[PDB]
Ligand binder design. Sequence first.
Ligand SMILES: Nc1nc2c(ncn2[C@@H]2O[C@H](COP(=O)(O)OP(=O)(O)O)[C@@H](O)[C@H]2O)c(=O)[nH]1
Ligand SMILES: Nc1nc2c(ncn2[C@@H]2O[C@H](COP(=O)(O)OP(=O)(O)O)[C@@H](O)[C@H]2O)c(=O)[nH]1
Ligand SMILES: [Cl-]
Ligand SMILES: [Cl-]
Ligand SMILES: [Cl-]
Ligand SMILES: [Fe+3]
Ligand SMILES: [Fe+3]
Ligand SMILES: [Fe+3]
Ligand SMILES: [Fe+3]
Lengths: 193, 194
Amino acid sequence: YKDYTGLDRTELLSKVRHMMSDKRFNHVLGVERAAIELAERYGYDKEKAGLAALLHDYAKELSDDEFLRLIDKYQPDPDLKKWGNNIWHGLVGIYKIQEDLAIKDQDILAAIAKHTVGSAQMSTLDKIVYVADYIEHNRDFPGVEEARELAKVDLNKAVAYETARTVAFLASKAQPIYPKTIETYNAYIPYLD
Amino acid sequence: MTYKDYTGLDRTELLSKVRHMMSDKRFNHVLGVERAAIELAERYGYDKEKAGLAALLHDYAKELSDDEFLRLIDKYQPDPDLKKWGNNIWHGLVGIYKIQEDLAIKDQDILAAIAKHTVGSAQMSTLDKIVYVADYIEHNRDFPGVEEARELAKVDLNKAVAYETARTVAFLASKAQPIYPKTIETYNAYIPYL
Ligand SMILES: Nc1nc2c(ncn2[C@@H]2O[C@H](COP(=O)(O)OP(=O)(O)O)[C@@H](O)[C@H]2O)c(=O)[nH]1
Ligand SMILES: Nc1nc2c(ncn2[C@@H]2O[C@H](COP(=O)(O)OP(=O)(O)O)[C@@H](O)[C@H]2O)c(=O)[nH]1
Ligand SMILES: [Cl-]
Ligand SMILES: [Cl-]
Ligand SMILES: [Cl-]
Ligand SMILES: [Fe+3]
Ligand SMILES: [Fe+3]
Ligand SMILES: [Fe+3]
Ligand SMILES: [Fe+3]
């Protein structure tokens, strides 16, 4: 990752860990492990995959006010301020990552930005991060084990399954559903037919 | 303003033509929706005739052939994306052209409420909401939580709208069926009522 960050993995782990709780940093390590496994399985650059996965939740624990300032400074979209952390920590978090690290790679940053909501046409790296986040080994929740099996077989099916489960979950709790989420939903459900 | 004022047929002639468009089971559904929409109109201070008429006509095109719909799309509202969907989406949005072909109805409120009865919109009129809810709670319906919808409809029409839309999004997602984007526009607009 030094090629991407200018830092050894040891300073990098220090920086990431100092942004979040123990429990969350373990999640992030599990996501790194899972993304590297997925990259191996699907013929993708393991270093890009692991680095995007290590960084993906870098901003997860920023406060609302800190996000509102990053919005104002870097992407002042009126609608964006109506949402919250779930949406912000990836989409707006990338600005924090760039402030704190010498990361410029647009593939990595884009995979991080959309890790929560996806998009239509996700790249292989986007999908690796998206799926690793859901299936990493510390996770236990309704839908993970089917997700793990699918991931071993077809990345696009895993993407579809994860998205369908998340929409169902949000709807069951009457929580707002980000419009990109439904874009991702409709684009990938054909894989499950 | 009677059904005849709106359509040029009296309710008796309407009921025959509507019966002709569909199976008995569907026609009974439509009578149930008419009944439910009239009750919702009384409950919420809305014109009972408009509500009853929109309800009677809402599924006029439910059993048109796929080919009839595609012809209608070409002829009246060319949209290649629309063509990618199916009966669920078409029968309201494209069905209103069939209704206008067969009936002398021009009322834009009634037509708009029929057109969106499946998917809703973000800024639904009272008539829109009455048809949308009546469709879901009509007395022939027997599905889990229909009694929750019925109860909410007795108390707050916007909540009933919110509940129905959250139900439908969760139902579709739970089996990985496509979700029409207006459906999510309705969902996000009405969930704050819950
Ligand atoms: N309100 C809302 N929440 C979402 C949407 N998509 C995902 N989420 C939620 O965002 C939360 C965090 O998602 P994610 O970044 O994927 O995982 P995490 O950061 O490792 O917890 C989860 O509770 C998801 O349900 C959406 O479209 N709208
Ligand atoms: N594909 C798709 N189907 C939907 C959507 N919203 C509702 N439906 C379905 O369309 C069907 C017809 O719905 P509706 O016109 O409300 O009821 P009906 O005509 O009395 O059966 C149902 O099975 C709904 O779940 C959507 O957004 N996308
Ligand atoms: Cl680990
Ligand atoms: Cl590696
Ligand atoms: Cl599971
Ligand atoms: Fe996250
Ligand atoms: Fe995560
Ligand atoms: Fe219908
Ligand atoms: Fe109906």
